[model samples]
Target: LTVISKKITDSNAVVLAVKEVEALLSSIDELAKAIGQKIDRNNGLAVEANFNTSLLAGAYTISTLITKKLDELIKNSGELKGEVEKAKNCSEAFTNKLKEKTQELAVAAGAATDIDAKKAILKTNRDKDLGADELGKLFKSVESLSKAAQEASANSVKEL
Candidate 1:
């Protein structure tokens, strides 16, 4: 009688919110890694100003991936009992900020008078936004979750 099927296994509030963010962060990380690989494969679009299109492509990909994460989270936000209260609002605000920031990076990457100017912001974003120590702390919290609520939230996301 492993009652894992009980609705009691579902996630709510912080658990759901954190797990959803986990999904979104991973989605962003994967795209950024792929973009890095592409830059390297091309013998370094990393410094080539003429390669503005490469930067734009990354924006499009990131925006697309984020949209999907929000979709999944939105679905979860609505379905589970014990609503996240303002989780919907939190998701919207978080989602909008990320999209806006990605667009901001898009513009920065494609514009900038010099390669130094363009690359600096992109590097900073990668440094801080991607896996910087601060952001790493963000994910560190998630690992703590995996150790703690891994089974609890794990069952939660799957109920959808």
Candidate 2:
């Protein structure tokens, strides 16, 4: 189910959202590690089954986790020090885009031949694709949000 999001004006609310982002970051990082393992595992699968069911499992694992984590991240970002709706919009859209990569990978694993696998892999991993340039954008957004959260938190503490 999709979440309805809005601006969070209260200082405590801001504090809460920042905490959520902080918690979410590590989980996403772990997701990255998992993705690497899957991609690496796919190589082994290619040899084992030619269909690489391992990659199917791997990509599927990531897509579901991405759905879960990013969904909550977008939902809870109402208290972001940046514009709230914008964060929700971008994150949700970004999450949607990222999911497609995994979805495609799962299918690629099932593509049954290296030719099809090579085709899909090269297609998605190209410049500006999630496999290449997009994570840097995510890094900036995450980093910026973290700083914004800390800045607001510090300032709020000053007003007490």
Candidate 3:
């Protein structure tokens, strides 16, 4: 269970990293097109000096916008990645705690000799099993949510 949970968390991180990369690529593409257009405007036949100056200004403006967008994207991505990492860490900690408790109960059950003590141990172990079952369900839910978030992020980039 721990391994499965860890895998899900890693997958989420990978998807987020991909999103950030795609964002950077798109920004570069836009900046390149803006620069190309500016160059074309200036180098065209019958181009006035004033028009050339305006084209240059437009290029600078586009570059500024691209840079600002990229900065904002990077900042947002960092925050998002941080939040996901926090969730992953919390899940891992919870799983570890569950494992420790389960092991403790198993040891208690194994050492029981008297009938009453054995019965008590059995009940405790049963309860622990229920708890573990619930934890498994929770982990599964987290995995599903993580996948959905990854898909949404991919779709968002496609729209952009």
Candidate 4:
């Protein structure tokens, strides 16, 4: 009877130790799950932050490009204006030379009446006037384009 009792006690102790080990294992499992969830949440937050930063960088790049293009447009418009002015001046000088030549020819021919010379001068002046009108239209177009570019820049800046 005494040996049987000792055997029973030993068996109970083994079972108790096994139960305690199992409980500890369960607790460790729960802790591991919680840690995994926290890590996943951290990774998600990091990804979101990176995405937001990239978006902001892209916006800045777009704004910079818009500014560069606007500056180029303004410069081109100024150059166009200068070229048009030079062309107009050159045309005026050419017309003056033509008039001088016509007078010289009339004097050489000993004729106070040069109808053909006058007709040529009139035609040239008419053509020049038309050309000036066309240039004026072009200038207005450039001006309109510049205004539009400025507005676009302003809009992009607002978005940022």
Candidate 5:
């Protein structure tokens, strides 16, 4: 009693988690850049008497926020990573099952002599049902994740 809907839901949940991690990572990168700019400004102002304590304090505050944000991102990202692994395992299991069913259908098609019967078997075997839909959705999820991962990696490098 493999419920296809549950599999879809699980994969979608994993995708959403990845999206959350990506969003947090983007925020962290932006904050890091801001901190760098603030540091440069503080260095330029170091020689001035009326040097703004506000500017220094602002930079410190942003740095503190960045630290907290990084902690949060790590925790959330760990959870997402687990979800991604789960989804990968589940998808692999489904793919195996799909292959088994397809093989069975191929045998049935070979055995059938009636044209209508063969056509029916072919349609059923090629049907965009449980496993096919799951694979299609999985492809979409992977495509989106790939883009997000690349963007996140690029931003992380910029921060460094």
Candidate 6:
């Protein structure tokens, strides 16, 4: 009877540990998704170390914890694999979005037409600390400048 009681207690302890690990994993998964969205909206500016060091640090720590608990997690919870995969996919999706936005800005600015050229322009701008929002506003200014030039050209042609 005592042996059976001890076995049940041990089993309950394992279950509790598994639950805690799952909660930690869920928190990390949510955090990664949230950060990914911010990166997407800010065009990767949110990835800057100055702005996200704490987030990066926390993510790294959680990653380490997840690695350590992986065996137990797999043994206990079938849902963890799907959650981890979803988090990874979210990160990739946001990264792609950031790149796309940079390319769009480069094209609008007339800085580059090809993908490689656009990437180079984006790199240069980032080096100069020009963020996506600022670049977007600059693109608008360039558009207005070109429009004004076209209008002036039309007026001069009419006068001639």
TM-score of 1: 0.38
lDDT of 5 by residue, 25-140 (tens): 34433432332132445464222222222332332343344234333433434334543444344345434444444332233323312222222212223554424344444434
Off by over 4 Å in 4: 36-160
lDDT (Cα, tens digit) per residue for candidate 6, span 1-160: 6765554454454445544545654564454344322454656434322123344345445544544553443353333444433333433332333344443323332332223222212323333221323323323332332233333344334434
- Best candidate according to lDDT: 2
What is the C-alpha RMSD, rounded to one decimal, of candidate 1? 7.6
lDDT of 2 by residue, 1-160 (tens): 1111222244445555645654554454443333323344545412333453344344334434433544465554444525444434444544555456554445543543333223322223344444324333444555565555664556545544
Model 3 deviation from native, Cα RMSD in Å? 28.7
Task: Return the candidate ranking by TM-score, descending.
Answer: 2, 1, 6, 5, 3, 4
Clashing residue pairs in candidate 4, if any?
none
Q: What is the alpha-carbon lDDT of model 1 when measured against the actual structure?
A: 0.43
Q: Which scores greater on lDDT, model 3 or model 4?
A: 3
Score each candidate by Cα lDDT.
0.43, 0.44, 0.37, 0.33, 0.37, 0.38
Candidate 3 residue runs with Cα over 4 Å from true position: 1-13, 16-79, 102-141, 144-160
Q: What digit string (tens of lDDT, one per residue) describes model 4 on residues 1-160?
A: 6765554454444333323323432342232222212234545422111112222223223323323333333333342345334433433443344344434223332332223222222222233331223323333433443343443344334444
Which candidate leads in TM-score? 2
Model 3, span 12-50: residue lDDT tens: 555665444344334433432332132355654331221
lDDT of 1 at 130: 21
- What TM-score fits each model? 0.38, 0.47, 0.27, 0.23, 0.31, 0.34
Q: All predictions: root-mean-square deviation over Cα? A: 7.6, 8.5, 28.7, 41.7, 26.7, 24.9
- Greater lDDT among 4 and 5 belongs to 5
List, in order, the clash count of every candidate structure: 0, 0, 0, 0, 0, 0
**Which model is ahead, 3 or 5, in terms of TM-score?**
5
